[PDB]
Structure formats: C-alpha cells, structure tokens
C-alpha cells in the first residue's frame, strides 16, 4: 500500500499472515467453503456430528 506520513507519501509492505487475507475476487468465499469440506472429509467428518 501507499500511505501518508507527516505530509509525505510512503510505501508499506506487510505479510498476509493467514490464507484468509487473500482478496475475495482472488480467493472467494465459496472456495473457502469447499476447502473446508475437503479438510473435513480428510478428517472423516464428512457427515459432521
């Protein structure tokens, strides 16, 4: 991002700590739902309690 610092514009870089922070248009919600289903099936919780 670009940001303001006492009348100057500066650049800022930060890590996306978790996979959820990816933009929706680039990793949408339905994809997260399907990935959660995948990991649940891997854990044998495919029909959950």
């Amino acid at each position: 991002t670009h940001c303001q610092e006492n009348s100057e514009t500066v650049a800022l870089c930060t890590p996306r700590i978790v996979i959820g922070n990816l933009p929706d248009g680039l990793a949408p919600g339905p994809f997260h739902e399907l990935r959660t289903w995948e990991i649940m099936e891997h854990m044998r919780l495919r029909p959950p309690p």
């Binding site: 303001q4 009348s7 100057e8 514009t9």
Partner: protein, 284 residues
C-alpha cells in the same frame, strides 16, 4: 417575565438586572459570572427548588442570547464587496500559471451568502483559503501540497505589530460578540502589492465573521447542554413523589429542548400555569 420560588426579592431583582445589562459587560458567558449561579442558593434550599431556579435562570439567559444575536448583514456586504475587489485585482496580475489562478478566481467570484445564519463560516473559509492561495502565488512563497491537507489561513507579509493588534481585536470580539466594531486596518500603499493588500483586508473581515459565529455557536451549545441536563435531573428528582401537581410538573418538563423555539415553548409553558406545580415544591 422570569419568576421562580424560594428567593428574596433583592436576589430576584439582582439577577434580572444582570440579564438586562448582559450585552454591556465583558465575558458574556454565564460561567464567567459564578456569583450569579450561587445566587440560586445551593446548600441554601432544597434540591428541587434550587434545580428549578437554575433551570429558569438558564432558560432566561438562553432567551437573552437568542434575542441579542447580532445582525451580521452589514459586514457580510463588505465581505462580498471585498471578494469582488480581490477577484478583479487577481484577474490582471501576471501570474506564471494562469490555470490554477483562474480556478481560484472562479471559486472567489462565485461566493455569496444565502441568508442562512449557520452557513456563513464555511463560505468564508472557502473564500479565504482561495484568496490566501492567490496571494501566496503572487508573492511566490511556497504553498502546501500534501494530499489531504489545505493551506492555513494567515496574513501575507503583514507588519508584525499590526498582526498582533488584529489578533487582540479578534480576541476582544471572542470575549463579547455583540458590540463588535472593526476599524483596525493600518495597511498602507507603499509596501506589498495591491493584490496582497486586498487579500489581507478580505481575510481580516472573514476571520472576524468566523470568530463571532463560532463563539455564538459554542455558547449556545453549552447553554443547551446545561438546560437538558437540568431538566433530566429535575425530572428524576420529582418522579419519586406521585401526585397531581408533581405529575403536571413532570409532564411539562418532559418536553425536549434542542432548538430556540423549543426553549421558548418550555419557558412560556412553565410561566403560564406556574400555579399548578408550585404547590408541589418545598420551601426553606
């Protein structure tokens, strides 16, 4: 007029003449005169009656403020004239970049007042920032460019002693906003261009208008807050005793106050049927 319980007539006449001579004293703020407040008699009377007295005093003070509200129209006309003069003089100046100069000339020449008493300050600020930008460009001193930021309003190349004198006059206006009379411009024809001189006069007039309006608005807001909180406290105090007169007083007090008209209605309603709720209040 104002009338309330529990006070000997000397204190009554004292405070009503205080209201009468309100406009002709410095520090027209009520809290600037604490002896008037304690005249209501805290620790002297019961909580109910002292709250009633303070509420009545604040209502009367608000009415006096709203009545004495200055007719700024005289100096608004001069401000418009000076905006026109600054624009006309700024057209002919040989600016290096005519584009942004023409933009600021346009915003200057568009300015006018719509007779809404609350809208004056922002119009003045817009005109003043454009004029100061033009003056700074004319003297070609540097000007702010950071995004989300605007040029501060200040005099350009004005003599320091005259600057502090103008600040003193503006402080005097801020102390008492009703007797304002500006005359102070000792500006001269020798130093500084004519455009700079016009901008300085315009910014003086505009800042005077801004200061008077802001002072009045702040004082009114404080008065409204005091009235509202007094009404809340008095209603809570009175609610514990269920009785016809107490219920009548509570129903009167339940009216919300957020405008001068609402304050007038509440004050007149308290005055008109004072007999009903006076029986409920204790004395001494």
């Amino acid at each position: 007029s104002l009338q309330f319980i529990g006070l000997q007539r000397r204190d009554v006449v004292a405070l009503v003449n205080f209201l009468r001579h309100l406009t002709q004293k410095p520090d027209v703020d009520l809290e600037a005169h604490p002896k008037i407040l304690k005249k209501c008699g805290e620790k002297r009377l019961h909580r109910r009656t002292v709250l009633f007295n303070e509420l009545m005093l604040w209502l009367g003070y608000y009415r006096e403020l709203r009545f004495h509200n200055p007719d700024l129209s005289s100096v608004l006309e001069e401000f418009e004239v000076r905006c026109v003069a600054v624009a006309r003089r700024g057209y002919t100046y040989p600016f290096g970049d005519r584009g942004k100069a023409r933009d600021h000339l346009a915003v200057l020449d568009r300015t006018e007042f719509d007779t809404d008493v609350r809208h004056d300050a922002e119009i003045v600020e817009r005109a003043l920032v454009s004029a100061v930008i033009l003056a700074k460009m004319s003297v070609r001193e540097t000007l702010v460019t950071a995004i989300g930021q605007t040029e501060p309003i200040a005099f350009v190349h004005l003599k320091d002693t005259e600057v502090q004198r103008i600040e003193e006059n503006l402080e005097g206006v801020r102390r008492n906003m009703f007797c304002v009379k500006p005359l102070d411009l000792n500006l001269d024809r020798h130093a500084n261009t004519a455009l700079v001189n016009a901008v300085n006069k315009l910014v003086y007039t505009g800042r005077l208008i801004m200061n008077v309006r802001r002072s009045w608005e702040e004082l009114e807001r404080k008065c409204l807050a005091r009235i509202q909180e007094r009404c809340k406290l008095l209603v809570k105090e009175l609610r514990m005793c269920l009785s016809f007169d107490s219920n009548y007083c509570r129903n009167i007090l339940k009216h919300a106050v957020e405008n001068g008209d609402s304050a007038d209605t509440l004050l007149e309603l308290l005055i008109e049927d004072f007999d009903i709720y006076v029986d409920s209040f204790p004395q001494s």
